[PDB]
Amino acid sequence: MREVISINVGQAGCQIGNACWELYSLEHGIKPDGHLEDGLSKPKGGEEGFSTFFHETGYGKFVPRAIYVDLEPNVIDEVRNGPYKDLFHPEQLISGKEDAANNYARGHYTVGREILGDVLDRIRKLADQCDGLQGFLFTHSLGGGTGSGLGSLLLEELSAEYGKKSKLEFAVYPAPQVSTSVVEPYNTVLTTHTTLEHADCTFMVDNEAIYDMCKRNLDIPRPSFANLNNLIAQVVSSVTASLRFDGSLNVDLNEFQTNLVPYPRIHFPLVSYSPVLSKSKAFHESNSVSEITNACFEPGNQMVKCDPRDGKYMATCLLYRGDVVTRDVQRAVEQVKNKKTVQLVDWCPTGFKIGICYEPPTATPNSQLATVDRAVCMLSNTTSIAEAWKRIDRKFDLMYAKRAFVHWYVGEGMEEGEFTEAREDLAALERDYIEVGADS
Amino acid sequence: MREIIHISTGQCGNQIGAAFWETICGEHGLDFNGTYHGHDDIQKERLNVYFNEASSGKWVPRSINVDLEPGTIDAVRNSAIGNLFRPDNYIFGQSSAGNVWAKGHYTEGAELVDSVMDVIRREAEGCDSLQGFQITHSLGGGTGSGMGTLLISKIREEFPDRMMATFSVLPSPKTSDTVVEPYNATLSVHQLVEHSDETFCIDNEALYDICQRTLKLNQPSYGDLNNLVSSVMSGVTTSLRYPGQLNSDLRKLAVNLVPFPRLHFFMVGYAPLTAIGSQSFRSLTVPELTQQMFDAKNMMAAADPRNGRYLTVAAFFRGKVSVKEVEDEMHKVQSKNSDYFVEWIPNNVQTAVCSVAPQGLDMAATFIANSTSIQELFKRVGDQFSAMFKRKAFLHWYTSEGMDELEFSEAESNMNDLVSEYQQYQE
Amino acid sequence: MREIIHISTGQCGNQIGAAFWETICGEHGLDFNGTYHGHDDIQKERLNVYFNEASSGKWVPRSINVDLEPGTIDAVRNSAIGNLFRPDNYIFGQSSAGNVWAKGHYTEGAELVDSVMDVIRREAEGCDSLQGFQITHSLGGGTGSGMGTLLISKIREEFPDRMMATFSVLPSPKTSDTVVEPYNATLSVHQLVEHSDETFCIDNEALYDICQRTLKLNQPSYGDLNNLVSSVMSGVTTSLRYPGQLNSDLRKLAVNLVPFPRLHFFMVGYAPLTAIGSQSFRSLTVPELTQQMFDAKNMMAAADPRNGRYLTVAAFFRGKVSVKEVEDEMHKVQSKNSDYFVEWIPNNVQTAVCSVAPQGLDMAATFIANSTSIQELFKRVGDQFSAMFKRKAFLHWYTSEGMDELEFSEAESNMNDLVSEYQQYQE
């Protein structure tokens, strides 16, 4: 039950997962080649990992159980050029013969489920090899309709298959100002329709706010996609650190699910991580975790185009890694009580879900952020995403009424009722988030 | 009935029991390898009470450690006196209940309850003079507050005559971390009021305050707090174990420390709480300890003597102390605090004296109290619970767990009834 | 009548007898070359009982090992104490019976039964004080289940007065690679119930469970199971061989252990079954041995005291044990399990005490019982036979061999009659 299976869907999904396995093997001191290197060395074994994500073979080789699914042959060639393909199994990676469409009209259609059946039995075969499961992990992007399509469909298939394990879906949200592909408004609304069907936990991240942090905090002139994948690899390693390493307050993955979702339906909590500063600035500043908590509450450390100060505050998750001072977190919760900036509704106030990790944080040398011995992760629910979806819903309603792309959609196998149901679902989630916000 | 069984569970109760065993073996004298080192005969009696004599003069501490983590048992094994342990004495499960009382004692606790119950039954078959069960866990953590509650309920259903000494750590209001922490605490105590008969109020914020005012520690760590509570437990168990002028039993506390069987919460305090390095200036006398006991800064509940109304009190002492001194101190504190001391007793007094000297101190003192202040914490946790479940906040997961809101309302009503009983008896 | 003959057959009984001789030599003291090493006279007595005094003080064990494979005799020769053996003591044939009891005791056994009977007749002529015959085989394999059954029938027809104690390994219900295994087992027992006088229930699944719970073995290995059954056999034979407070004969077991002559099965258990490494924590006492014996986890039948009804029991001990302690334990277990203990006995007790200390242990214990679970196992194997031969699967082999469905139904009716005798006598 302790094992965790991760899925990599779409071009950005494989790039995020590759950085995830890169930082993973880097923390435990494992080379990307294999055998080993080295260990299973103090304490790279028990407590797991690396045995939850890195399955140990008969010879001791720690193979990362990941499924790289993408209908683009270029992405399959990219993940095969790296040494992690040698670490991976040829049956773990699923090669894409041809891209369905550009990019979601056919990815979520019958052409998508033709390959999903092959991946489904591969998951069943993988489940027969390694028993036990803690939660389903997903990595994809909303800009790539194939990643969001195959990821949402596979999420629904395993939900109807088991339905007992948690579902952690990482979805990359494009910026509301730039439109890398005009089909994205249709995909994001139809993706919210798939989440209304089945969704346990979805993480919304905006590339615009992340690139703004590299320009301001990391002092990067041109933030690349590799720095974004490394940052996501950092925020996901700190979240799973409660299961990997030891800590005074070990938080279960299902505990994150039963201490985050209040209402009969809410699936989209926001994530924030700190500190994210430059190398020279990290050598010049030696603040404690109290200042990191105060800076993590700011919208700058949110990595998303949403302001937690504007939206009302709900009970959040505050994870710590490294040397944690009980007085500092007591002083941290003392200052936020004295802040009284965000709307403290009568239900949350005594809530900042604490996760303590004795392992110090570790950052990749490629990332401009220096390796710090202390980190704070704030994962909160904020009504700002309802405003962001409303803008996306307004753009989607304008394009849908313009019928410039609906003709191609009904030719691919879509219907007018399907897009309206996704619109009615998205409008219901925004109304629900507003209703649960106005109850203060 | 001199033998006492010790139960350890939860993410904090494991270290609490480890520190308890450390303080016990430091009090009577014993090596971590089981070699007898005490002198001369009473230490063998304490070992027969709390330990088991294995082959080649070995001694194994009679403790039942259970938790949903192998890291916990590994860490308590890495302790000084933590190495030798019978594989049947400790049974740990997988993987986690996740700070939830319902899931803690419904799914993660129901799978390992049979094993630990068989273990405790075999121990009772091997322990003839068992009298009470020392429960050490944290009411803040839902996993511990569920597992220990389930174990206490099963022991009460199995051994209703045996005493239940619970040293659970109450959640702190300053800790604004998990809204499910005080809610799990109140759900667990709603059953512990009927499953347990002796509970001691221990607040984490109280421990932080007492280590920041006396020890002057920059970072309040569980180590020194567990050391303090283990010294308190060692004192209150050597009040009967170690020879003295008068020995106090758990049954003696059940028939003297509490007037009505509904009340089971007792506020504890220890002395002397001397500052680090100021031991040369401190003169161990009776008036200073008496003044320290009736102050809110030395209590670990932590209650204010000016706010609540004293329903009953008790003060136990270890070391060379005179009965006339403590009698005069009690008379003075009754003449000066007649408003706090309730009038229907009319004079509350329960003193035990141990002639033996405490470990490392010339004289030590413990204080137990029952006032009208625990109802204030009950009101606080009830208001937190009510304001936390008006939006179904973090609650639909609990509904899928199987619990209903009617049980929660009944728990709140029982807590309000207990508060009204503590207001009878008004403040 | 102190001398006992040993017969070994089957794919597992060969190693069982090898381990039996190994443990006998390890108990009394002897080299594999026949050199006497015991001290002083009781060891020579055991040697005259079990081994043969050859020239130059050589000692060769009186064992009749037979199997349809030269690899078996080669392996028991390459074993530690397996080098010297008279070529007449062992006779092996070719080639195989195809895991079929009928073929094994009709063709593969009929060609060597004359030779093995001549050998056993010469051995009985040379051995004046022979009392019992210890058979070691596995009821699972058809070849061994046929060979041992034929040998037991022939020895019963030749010397009906000599006792017949069999340690046949019962098949496991989990193993389903060959559906003919339990069917051959029940066809063998249908004749063994009349050809033998005492049989001991030994299940492969029970052995796997006990070794995985005590020794914590990953893969089921026959070595430790054979060593355990060897220790059991050594204990039950030294109950008479080695001096003690009272010696129990095979005739004594026959006239004190079974109420009616139709019953011949006995469920066995051994103690202490201590975990690996916990020997320092374990203290060899009488209550723990009694608990292990009356618990189902230490039984090798394997039976459940809560399910079956105790008809009769017996407990033998080796080492420094107290008669008053064992009497108190028997009284307590009778008062606590009077529901299992049947009322027409009314108090079943049969205790033998050996003053000598066990090899490597301060005290050891064996337990024999007759509950109502053997009839449940009979029902299970009969239902297996019925559900496997309703479809007439692999029945052409037996129709070509020559066995009859009327004979199968007669065997099933005899098993049902035994079940009624064990339910007479309700559960």
Author numbering:
A (entry chain Ar): 1 to 440
B (entry chain Be), C (entry chain Bf): 1 to 427
Q: Can you provide the manuscript's text about this entry?
A:
We determined a consensus reconstruction of the native yeast γTuRC, capping the α/β-tubulin lattice at the minus end, to a global resolution of 9.2 Å. In our γTuRC reconstruction, seven γTuSC protomers assemble side-on to generate a pseudo-helical γTuRC at the base of the MT lattice, consisting of 14 spokes (formed by Spc98:γ-tubulin and Spc97:γ-tubulin of γTuSC promoters). As spoke 14 is positioned directly above spoke 1, γTuRC presents 13 γ-tubulin molecules for MT nucleation (spokes 2–14). The geometry of the active γTuRC matches that of a 13-PF MT lattice perfectly, with a helical rise of 84 Å, a helical twist of ~28° and a width of 220 Å. Relative to unassembled yeast γTuSC modules, and γTuSC modules assembled into the open γTuSC filament, the closed ring conformation of native γTuRC requires tightening and tilting of the two γ-tubulin subunits of each γTuSC module, so as to match the lateral α/β-tubulin geometry of the MT lattice. This γ-tubulin interface reorganization is facilitated by straightening of the gamma ring protein 2 (GRIP2) domain of Spc98 and bending of the GRIP2 domain of Spc97. γTuRC ring closure is then accommodated by leaving an empty gap above the Spc97:γ-tubulin spoke 1 of γTuSC-1. Ring closure at the γTuRC seam, which aligns with the MT lattice seam, is achieved through interactions between Spc98:γ-tubulin of γTuSC-7 and the first α/β/α-tubulin row of the MT lattice. The essential Spc110 N-terminus forms a dimeric coiled coil (Spc110NCC) at the base of six γTuSC modules (γTuSC-1 to γTuSC-6). The Spc110NCC bound to the last γTuSC of the ring (γTuSC-7, spokes 13 and 14) also binds to the first γ-tubulin of γTuSC-1 (spoke 1), probably further stabilizing γTuRC ring closure. The γTuRC luminal density is compact and connects multiple γTuSC modules from the inside of the lumen, interacting specifically across inter-γTuSCs interfaces of γTuSC-3 to γTuSC-5.
